[PDB]
Design a protein around this ligand. Structure first.
Ligand SMILES: Nc1ncnc2c1ncn2[C@@H]1O[C@H](COP(=O)(O)CP(=O)(O)OP(=O)(O)O)[C@@H](O)[C@H]1O
Ligand SMILES: Nc1ncnc2c1ncn2[C@@H]1O[C@H](COP(=O)(O)CP(=O)(O)OP(=O)(O)O)[C@@H](O)[C@H]1O
Ligand SMILES: [Sr+2]
Ligand SMILES: [Sr+2]
Lengths: 194, 198
């Protein structure tokens, strides 16, 4: 648990359109919708041996390579599989929400995911009032920035991650100017299928 | 830790600093953790001392709740939230002074750390969210979104609250009043910058 430097893969995912959709239901319905979604995301992370760092509203943060050790290649394979499984889950959820009148009659929820691999100080951070296991550093900052920079319903990863992805699966490449980073970052949108 | 999601009038506080990453690039692993913990310690102590609830940390950002899980009058929620925000800002200045003396800031031109805080009071669904596999206690809804947006809209080293919060603050303690259009918000919001001092 004690914080230490380690090569890990960070995954950030978020949905946009949840608030708008929930705007019609009462508290109970809002909670049911969100729990439905968070449960699916958690399942996608656990099934691929990932660590659920935390939820941030309707955003999710997962780690691969901590606390349990994991090779860099397996971290990426698992992180990618999680992102693709999350998209499938959202496709299922959206189908249910549309047949429910929550979407279509309010557009379908959209998904964005960013994945980066790099060094990060990982372990328990906080105080006596509150301590949580997480990852800190530019690598984490970058993964979050990728998630916010990618287009609707897509997965964006860094070059460090893409090097383990079959070439034919990289749909689009583009250098992006990310906040706090001087050197433009080569990003790769990967095929959400396989 | 057992609370099922329920609607409730609460006060949400979001605070965040800028300059940690920059300041920490000039240090090493163990130093990062100790530096982050030093700051987080000051922040949580400010929340705890004011009987607030620390919801979570989001990197170096802090989220605190007043009125949940334990009940709290709407006026006490604001008093404690306001006192919390002010104490955090004072602690940050104390921290910057120490970091300055240690050469962590004001050297290799790493500006001193900047603090921002947003506070809003309104209805929110509070309780455990997630699934049997993983769930955490937090607050959800437009009211929470607004508090987050107020913190990101206010200027460096300042505290910004909504009209719902201001109504409990002595008028002379309100530095500035202005309408700002927050994201996803149809009706512009009345923002009030509070004096960092009582
Ligand atoms: N429970 C929670 N804990 C921490 N932050 C929360 C939160 N609920 C909401 N927020 C914060 O409130 C802000 C919401 O603004 P946005 O991210 O722009 C909403 P959106 O992604 O555009 O659509 P959405 O509301 O359907 O998800 C974010 O900064 C988010 O992290
Ligand atoms: N441990 C963590 N958990 C969740 N999100 C994290 C995180 N560490 C970093 N992030 C995310 O990474 C992004 C960092 O970008 P910014 O918020 O713009 C940093 P900043 O506030 O400008 O300066 P700073 O790095 O000194 O804090 C945010 O979206 C933040 O929420
Ligand atoms: Sr979102
Ligand atoms: Sr910050």
């Amino acid at each position: 648990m004690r914080p230490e430097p380690r090569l890990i893969t960070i995954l950030f995912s978020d949905i946009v359109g949840f608030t708008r959709m929930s705007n019609a239901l009462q508290s109970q319905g809002v909670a049911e919708l969100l729990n439905e979604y968070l449960g699916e995301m958690t399942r996608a992370v656990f099934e691929n041996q990932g660590t659920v760092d935390k939820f941030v509203g309707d955003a999710i943060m997962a780690l691969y390579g901590a606390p349990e050790e994991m090779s860099p290649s397996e971290q990426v394979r698992r992180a990618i599989a999680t992102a693709r499984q999350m998209l499938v889950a959202l496709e299922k959820l959206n189908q249910g929400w549309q047949e429910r009148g929550l979407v279509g009659r309010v557009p379908p929820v959209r998904f964005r995911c960013g994945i980066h691999q790099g060094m990060a100080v990982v372990g328990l951070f906080g105080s006596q009032e509150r301590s949580d296991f997480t990852a800190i550093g530019p690598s984490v900052n970058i993964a979050a920035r990728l998630q916010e920079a990618t287009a609707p319903n897509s997965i964006m990863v860094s070059a460090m991650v893409a090097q383990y992805v079959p070439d034919e699966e990289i749909i689009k490449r583009e250098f992006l100017e990310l906040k706090g980073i001087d050197e433009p970052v080569m990003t790769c949108v990967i095929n959400p299928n396989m």
